[PDB]
Amino acid sequence: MIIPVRCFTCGKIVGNKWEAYLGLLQAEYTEGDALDALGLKRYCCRRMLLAHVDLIEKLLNYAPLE
């Protein structure tokens, strides 16, 4: 529902990289290049950004008030 804070297997902080990864994908980069541009060497930490689903948006659509 939200990007984790750390890679389950490794432990490297990955939570602070979701917005950057999205920006890099948006401008021109491709995933395979954006991932190493952020500095994710081990394939264990890449699954965090590739596989992660972003449901928090759908959750925010149900605004309590206004």
């Binding site: 529902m1 939200i2 990007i3 984790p4 804070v5 750390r6 890679c7 490794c10 432990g11 490297k12 902080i13 939570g15 602070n16 990289k17 979701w18 917005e19 950057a20 081990r42 928090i56 959750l59 925010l60 149900y62 605004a63 309590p64 008030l65 206004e66």
Partner: protein, 258 residues
């Protein structure tokens, strides 16, 4: 009938990871230092979260869980603080803990991004990693929601929980050529040469070596950002030395009592 004279040589020192080499030491010592790197390294981290008003879309415990995982720079504070369990006072005293406060409320129309930068610490030096590269996203708030809480941090080590795990990933590897045959390749040609392999590209693996002991352990400790890597190594060495010292004292007392 005594110990050995290990040597050390750093190959790559940065503010993010350290790659060094240890020579003339036993495998047990190397792997033990590794396990101390991962498990027994003092570090600060959030451990007590009191939530006063949480109107976000995530659970109450989700916020505390995430806040448990945000690293905190402890370069010179972990050594000074004392474990809360061994403190001699009630409530989280500043001498034995670091307090945190967070109070955000999405008023404008655009969705907020409550990042670690909202964690206003009382102490100057104990802050999340934002000094010098976005910040750890905690939760997203929408107009009308709010999140008020305060949490305290305390010293622990990875063995108790992962939050106290300073190292991202320790790359430990010795004898890059399979000279001691500790592993048997069914088809050696099919395997790629190790980064530390001195062997040329023709031969697949070094010839067997009967009278050969493991030396030249290669380390690639990688700090998560809480402590500096060389600081992790120094703390691990000091902690292991202390554990041995305590054990020796206990054994001495036991023998004397007998």
């Amino acid at each position: 009938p005594y110990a050995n004279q290990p040597t050390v040589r750093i190959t790559e020192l940065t503010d993010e990871n350290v790659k060094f080499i240890i020579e003339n030491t036993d495998l047990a010592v190397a792997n033990s230092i590794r396990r101390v790197f991962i498990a027994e390294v003092p570090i600060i981290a959030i451990d007590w979260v009191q939530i006063d008003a949480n109107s976000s879309v995530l659970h109450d415990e989700f916020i505390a869980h995430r806040l448990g995982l945000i690293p905190l720079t402890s370069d010179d504070i972990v050594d000074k603080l004392q474990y809360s369990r061994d403190c001699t006072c009630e409530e989280f005293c500043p001498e034995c803990s670091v307090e945190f406060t967070l109070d955000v409320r999405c008023n404008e129309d655009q969705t907020r991004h409550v990042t670690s930068r909202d964690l206003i610490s009382n102490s100057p030096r104990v802050i999340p990693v934002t000094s010098r590269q976005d910040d750890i996203l905690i939760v997203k708030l929408r107009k009308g929601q709010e999140l008020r809480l305060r949490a305290y941090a305390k010293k622990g080590f990875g063995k108790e929980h992962a939050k106290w795990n300073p190292t991202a990933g320790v790359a430990f590897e010795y004898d890059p050529d399979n000279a001691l045959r500790h592993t048997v390749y069914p088809k050696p040609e099919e395997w790629p040469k190790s980064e530390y392999s001195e062997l040329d590209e023709d031969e697949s693996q070094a010839p067997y070596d009967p009278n050969g002991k493991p030396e030249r352990f290669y380390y690639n400790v990688e700090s998560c950002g809480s402590l500096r890597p060389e600081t992790i190594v120094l703390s691990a060495l000091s902690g292991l030395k202390k554990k041995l010292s305590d054990l020796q004292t206990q054994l001495s007392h036991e023998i004397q009592s007998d």
